[PDB]
Structure formats: C-alpha cells, structure tokens
C-alpha cells in the first residue's frame, strides 16, 4: 500500500 | 578539470542533505523496540530499516531535480533503491576493526549474527559484509558517498518508472561532477570511478537477494507482524 508514502506532499 | 558553480552547487547541497538526515549521534536509537539477543532482533532492526527509510526519503527530496518529477517516478525510484541506499549509508557506522556497524554503545552495535537473528542468511549478509569491507577501503570522501547515494537513487534503469529520459538526465550530471571531482581531488581518476559504479553493480544483486528473503519473512504473519508500516509499503509488493 502506498498511503503512507504519498507525506513524497 | 574543474568544478563549475553549479557543480561546486550540487556538491554543497548534496553534502548538506545528507548532514541533514544523518545524525552522528544516533539518539533516536533509543526509542526503536529494543534489540534483544526465534528472530528476536527483528523489532529493532525492523525499526531501524523503517527510521532510515524516512531519512532517505529527505535526503531524496533534497537532491537537485528529484523533487520535479513525478510523485509517481519519485516513489518508484524510491521503493526500488532504498535498501541499496541503506546499505550504501551504513558503511558510515561500519568499522573494520570490529566488522561490525556500531552506532555508540554496545546495545546498537550490530554484527552479522545479529542480523541472523531478524530472519536473513548468510547468502545476503557475508556478501554484504563483503561489500562493505571493500567500499571502507576506498576510503571515499564524504562528497563522493553523497553523490554515490544519489546517482544510486537517480538510475533510470528501475522498474515502473515513466519518465526515463528526463531521470537519466539528472544521473549523468551527478556521475559527471563525481567524475570531475574524482580527477581533481586524485592522481589519474577513471579507475576509482570504475569501482564505485561496479559497487552499485554489487548493491543491485544484494537487494535482489534481500528482496527473496523479506518476501519469505513477510509472508509469516509471526514475523510480518513484528515490521512497521513504513517497511511494508516500501519493501512490498504492492502498487
Ligand atoms: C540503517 C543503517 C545502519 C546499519 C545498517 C545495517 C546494520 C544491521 C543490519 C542491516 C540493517 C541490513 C539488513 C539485512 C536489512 C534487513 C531489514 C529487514 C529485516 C526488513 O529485511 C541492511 C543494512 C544493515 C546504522 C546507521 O549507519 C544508519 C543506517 O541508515
């Protein structure tokens, strides 16, 4: 999962 | 030979930004789960992975021209490279004289059984002990691992990502100062280069077998939920 990695704003 | 500006510009900010995202006193060691010593160091060692993660993730963004590219590209370089970069960062607490990575006392000095102990083999860690005698003894200035770490991060040549020309673009300007740097700063020059970029040959196969041993760690609900969320979504197979 990639939610934690959308703080790339 | 020799340095522009804006290449003298680069090197200063590159240096600054691993300054930044690289604290020498590792006092946030203290507030990772414990290391104890059935994979009893995986909490913390899970825990460090997860921190550096973050502090690579500044360092990227910190890096001239990452941050204009896509979300998407800059998250594919990112998922593809961390681990090469963590190796890469963390011959700064390797230490010859004891073969091991020590970040202040003996409590978060690491050595190889310890790693045993997270759930990985020696078929990744003596080739990554391996790897980290031979870049100590290249003796690199702090320039030349900061510009090593971004064009390791920059290759074009990972999967998903889009843009490729406007990516290798920025690599050959990094690999360009670090080139110029080299024949300045040493007698001759290419043959120096030469290994530094067949240590990212070597830091390619040494995520390539640590990919194969997180995949089985994963995928054992005892271990995977020892990890961190952070971990899971960089380390993942996810999309
Ligand atoms: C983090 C960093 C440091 C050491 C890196 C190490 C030491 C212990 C074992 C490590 C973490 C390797 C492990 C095989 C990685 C496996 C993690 C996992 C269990 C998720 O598969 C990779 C790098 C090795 C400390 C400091 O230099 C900061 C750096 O930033």
Same mark, same amino acid.
């Given at each position: 999962?990639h939610k934690?990695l959308?703080?790339?704003? | 030979?020799?340095l522009?500006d *804006?290449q003298?510009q680069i090197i200063? +900010?590159?240096?600054?930004?691993? /300054?930044?995202?690289?604290?020498?006193?590792?006092?946030?060691?203290?507030?990772?789960?414990?290391?104890?010593?059935? %994979? !009893?160091?995986?909490p /913390?060692?899970?825990?460090?992975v997860?921190? +550096?993660?973050?502090?690579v993730?500044?360092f990227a963004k910190?890096i001239?021209?990452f941050?204009?590219?896509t979300?998407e590209?800059?998250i594919?370089? %990112?998922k593809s490279?961390?681990?090469?970069?963590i190796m890469?960062? !963390?011959?700064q607490s390797?230490?010859?004289?004891d073969? !091991?990575?020590? =970040?202040?006392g003996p409590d978060f000095?690491? =050595? &190889?059984?310890?790693?045993?102990?997270a759930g990985?083999?020696? *078929?990744?860690?003596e080739?990554?002990?391996?790897?980290?005698?031979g870049?100590?003894?290249?003796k690199? /200035?702090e *320039?030349?691992?900061?510009?090593?770490?971004?064009? =390791?991060?920059?290759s074009?040549?990972?999967?998903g990502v889009?843009d490729?020309?406007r990516?290798?673009?920025?690599?050959?300007?990094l690999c360009?100062?670090?080139?110029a740097?080299?024949r &300045?700063? /040493?007698?001759g020059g290419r043959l %120096?280069?030469?290994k530094?970029?067949?240590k990212?040959?070597?830091l390619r +196969? %040494?995520?390539?077998?640590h990919?194969?041993?997180?995949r089985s760690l994963s995928?054992?609900?005892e271990h995977?939920?020892?990890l961190t969320?952070?971990?899971?979504e960089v380390?993942?197979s996810?999309?």
């Open positions: 999962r934690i959308x703080x790339x704003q | 030979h020799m522009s *804006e003298m200063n +900010s590159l240096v600054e930004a691993h /300054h930044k995202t690289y604290d020498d006193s590792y006092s946030d060691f203290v507030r990772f789960r414990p290391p104890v010593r059935r %994979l !009893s160091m995986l /913390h060692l899970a825990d460090l997860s921190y +550096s993660i973050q502090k993730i500044g910190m001239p021209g941050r204009d590219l979300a590209d800059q594919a370089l %990112l490279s961390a681990i090469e970069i890469l960062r !963390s011959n390797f230490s010859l004289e073969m !091991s990575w020590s =970040c202040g000095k690491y =050595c &190889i059984n310890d790693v045993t102990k990985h083999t020696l *078929e990744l860690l080739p990554l002990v391996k790897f980290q005698v870049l100590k003894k290249l690199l /200035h *320039e030349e691992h900061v510009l090593l770490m971004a064009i =390791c991060l920059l074009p040549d990972r999967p889009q490729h020309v990516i290798e673009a920025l690599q050959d300007r360009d100062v670090l080139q740097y080299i &300045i700063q /040493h007698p %120096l280069y030469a530094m970029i067949q990212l040959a070597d +196969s %040494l995520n390539e077998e990919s194969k041993q997180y995928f054992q609900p995977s939920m020892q969320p952070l971990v899971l380390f993942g996810e999309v």
